[PDB]
Amino acid sequence: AQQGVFTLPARINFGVTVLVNSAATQHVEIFVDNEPRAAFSGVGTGDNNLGTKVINSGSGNVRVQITANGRQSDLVSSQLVLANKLNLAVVGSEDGTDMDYNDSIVILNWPLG
Amino acid sequence: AQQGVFTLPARINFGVTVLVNSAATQHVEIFVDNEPRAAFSGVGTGDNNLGTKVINSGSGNVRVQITANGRQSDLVSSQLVLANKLNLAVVGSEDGTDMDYNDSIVILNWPLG
Amino acid sequence: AQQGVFTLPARINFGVTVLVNSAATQHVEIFVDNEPRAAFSGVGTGDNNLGTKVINSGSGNVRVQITANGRQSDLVSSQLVLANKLNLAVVGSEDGTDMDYNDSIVILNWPLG
Amino acid sequence: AQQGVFTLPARINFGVTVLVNSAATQHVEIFVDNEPRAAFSGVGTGDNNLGTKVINSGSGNVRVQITANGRQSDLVSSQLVLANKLNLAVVGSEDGTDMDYNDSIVILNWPLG
Numbered sequence: 001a002q003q004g005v006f007t008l009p010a011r012i013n014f015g016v017t018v019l020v021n022s023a024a025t026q027h028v029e030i031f032v033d034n035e036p037r038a039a040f041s042g043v044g045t046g047d048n049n050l051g052t053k054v055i056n057s058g059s060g061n062v063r064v065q066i067t068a069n070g071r072q073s074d075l076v077s078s079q080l081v082l083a084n085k086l087n088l089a090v091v092g093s094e095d096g097t098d099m100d101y102n103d104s105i106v107i108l109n110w111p112l113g
Numbered sequence: 114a115q116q117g118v119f120t121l122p123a124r125i126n127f128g129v130t131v132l133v134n135s136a137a138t139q140h141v142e143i144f145v146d147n148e149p150r151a152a153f154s155g156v157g158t159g160d161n162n163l164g165t166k167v168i169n170s171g172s173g174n175v176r177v178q179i180t181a182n183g184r185q186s187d188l189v190s191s192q193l194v195l196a197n198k199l200n201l202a203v204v205g206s207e208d209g210t211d212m213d214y215n216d217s218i219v220i221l222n223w224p225l226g
Numbered sequence: 227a228q229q230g231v232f233t234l235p236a237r238i239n240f241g242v243t244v245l246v247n248s249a250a251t252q253h254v255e256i257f258v259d260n261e262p263r264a265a266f267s268g269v270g271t272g273d274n275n276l277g278t279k280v281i282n283s284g285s286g287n288v289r290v291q292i293t294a295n296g297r298q299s300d301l302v303s304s305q306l307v308l309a310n311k312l313n314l315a316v317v318g319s320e321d322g323t324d325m326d327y328n329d330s331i332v333i334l335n336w337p338l339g
Numbered sequence: 340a341q342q343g344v345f346t347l348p349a350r351i352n353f354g355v356t357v358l359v360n361s362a363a364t365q366h367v368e369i370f371v372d373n374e375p376r377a378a379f380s381g382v383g384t385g386d387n388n389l390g391t392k393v394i395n396s397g398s399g400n401v402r403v404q405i406t407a408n409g410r411q412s413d414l415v416s417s418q419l420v421l422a423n424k425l426n427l428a429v430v431g432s433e434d435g436t437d438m439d440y441n442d443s444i445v446i447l448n449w450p451l452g
């Protein structure tokens with residue numbers, strides 16, 4: 001199945017947070033309606049927090065892509081809703097051979113404020 | 114049900130990341146085996162990222178506590194496992210009256226590295 | 227936080243499946259727009275499957291209530307989305323003192339077909 | 340990533356429940372330690388419930404396999420823990436071209452009783 005693809009409410013601001021756990025430099029790109037709208041990069045094995053960016057969901061079509069070593073990482077993803085209100089969309093990714101799926105972890109959340 | 118309490122693998126390092134979305138200053142404490150092991154605080158309505166701290170799970174008994182305006186916030190939580198490997202334990206919290214449950218969002222993840 | 231309350235897409239058919247793990251007889255009621263629309267009852271400690279019923283979500287406001295021993299059970303719930311398409315809304319419940327939260331398990335899923 | 344594979348607590352009884360939503364006859368096999376331990380089959384587009392079977396997790400290595408039209412369906416999966424106690428492992432599957440991932444839905448839950 002496709003992974004890292006989420007339908008958000010239209011025209012909503014959402015946060016994107018990235019954590020890294022790899023020796024390979026990670027490159028995360030967030031697409032909204034197929035347009036490149038947020039980028040992160042970093043490296044480190046101690047859950048290195050690359051910060052949070054807030055962007056708008058456009059029509060709602062959001063996609064996460066992660067690269068390392070010049071190639072697309074393998075993705076795994078899910079969406080969770082807590083208290084019928086708090087949404088988290090989570091992506092884990094694997095750049096190598098150990099199947100730890102923590103090399104980049106991308107968290108989308110909404111609503112904000 | 115109790116919320117914000119998780120059983121982790123014993124003696125594992127895990128990351129804790131906090132985002133805030135409230136006018137009230139948030140105070141997060143992470144307990145391991147009933148002892149305080151990590152603190153965060155901050156205020157903001159823009160999904161403001163308080164950083165990540167790595168701590169050890171001890172026997173595995175981890176509890177997230179969130180306080181604002183001198184009162185423990187109402188918590189909601191769950192744990193997700195992706196690819197049979199990546200664990201996220203998520204806590205939303207409500208400090209007020211709007212039931213948005215985003216006032217502090219606390220994310221635990223393991224394994225690291 | 228309120229638990230067992232979910233916002234579904236409007237006017238959608240969804241399935242409700244109930245499993246029981248208790249010596250106390252369980253009574254599950256599904257409300258749609260505050261109206262009583264599906265009922266299940268049963269007992270047993272071996273994950274006894276009470277079947278699946280398909281009902282319509284109306285405006286989208288769905289609530290799960292569970293009783294045993296004449297009183298409302300304590301609920302815990304979450305919603306999961308897989309492949310950006312398959313929705314499960316899950317309720318666990320506790321009728322007693324052992325905090326196993328399996329006494330009735332209610333699963334809502336959509337879309338069908 | 341591999342999907343439909345879960346590590347359960349060792350030697351635990353768990354329930355497996357299957358729902359179908361397809362014109363194609365579904366065949367579900369649950370493997371424990373690489374050995375077949377439970378089968379289900381059926382066909383229907385109405386979230387049709389194939390029942391629940393209880394089996395033992397052995398060493399803990401559980402795999403869900405879903406076949407339709409003689410081909411293994413594409414799987415998506417995750418595990419959820421509620422109240423730090425109730426575990427659900429969920430598998431959606433796609434036998435065709437519409438990407439609805441509901442063709443068989445397999446739900447594992449533990450602990451029982």
Ligand SMILES: CO[C@@H]1O[C@@H](C)[C@@H](O)[C@@H](O)[C@@H]1O
Nearest residue numbers: 021022023024096098100226
């Ligand atoms: C070389 O492998 C990459 O870096 C290592 C330090 C590990 O984080 C591993 O999971 C990752 O895939």
Ligand SMILES: CO[C@@H]1O[C@@H](C)[C@@H](O)[C@@H](O)[C@@H]1O
Nearest residue numbers: 113134135136208209211213
């Ligand atoms: C006063 O209420 C608090 O601050 C507001 C700006 C909102 O973030 C609200 O959710 C929060 O509970």
Ligand SMILES: CO[C@@H]1O[C@@H](C)[C@@H](O)[C@@H](O)[C@@H]1O
Nearest residue numbers: 247248249250322324326452
């Ligand atoms: C009397 O307690 C009820 O029945 C027992 C057999 C257990 O299933 C328990 O979890 C449940 O709360």
Ligand SMILES: CO[C@@H]1O[C@@H](C)[C@@H](O)[C@@H](O)[C@@H]1O
Nearest residue numbers: 339360361362434435437439
């Ligand atoms: C032929 O396609 C199969 O049957 C249809 C009735 C739908 O349930 C579809 O999702 C499924 O893949």
Ligand SMILES: [Ca+2]
Nearest residue numbers: 095096100103
């Ligand atoms: Ca890796």
Ligand SMILES: [Ca+2]
Nearest residue numbers: 021100103226
């Ligand atoms: Ca790694």
Ligand SMILES: [Ca+2]
Nearest residue numbers: 208209213214
């Ligand atoms: Ca609030």
Ligand SMILES: [Ca+2]
Nearest residue numbers: 113134213216
């Ligand atoms: Ca808020």
Ligand SMILES: [Ca+2]
Nearest residue numbers: 321322326329
């Ligand atoms: Ca109980």
Ligand SMILES: [Ca+2]
Nearest residue numbers: 247326329452
């Ligand atoms: Ca029970």
Ligand SMILES: [Ca+2]
Nearest residue numbers: 434435439440
């Ligand atoms: Ca299909």
Ligand SMILES: [Ca+2]
Nearest residue numbers: 339360439442
């Ligand atoms: Ca289908």
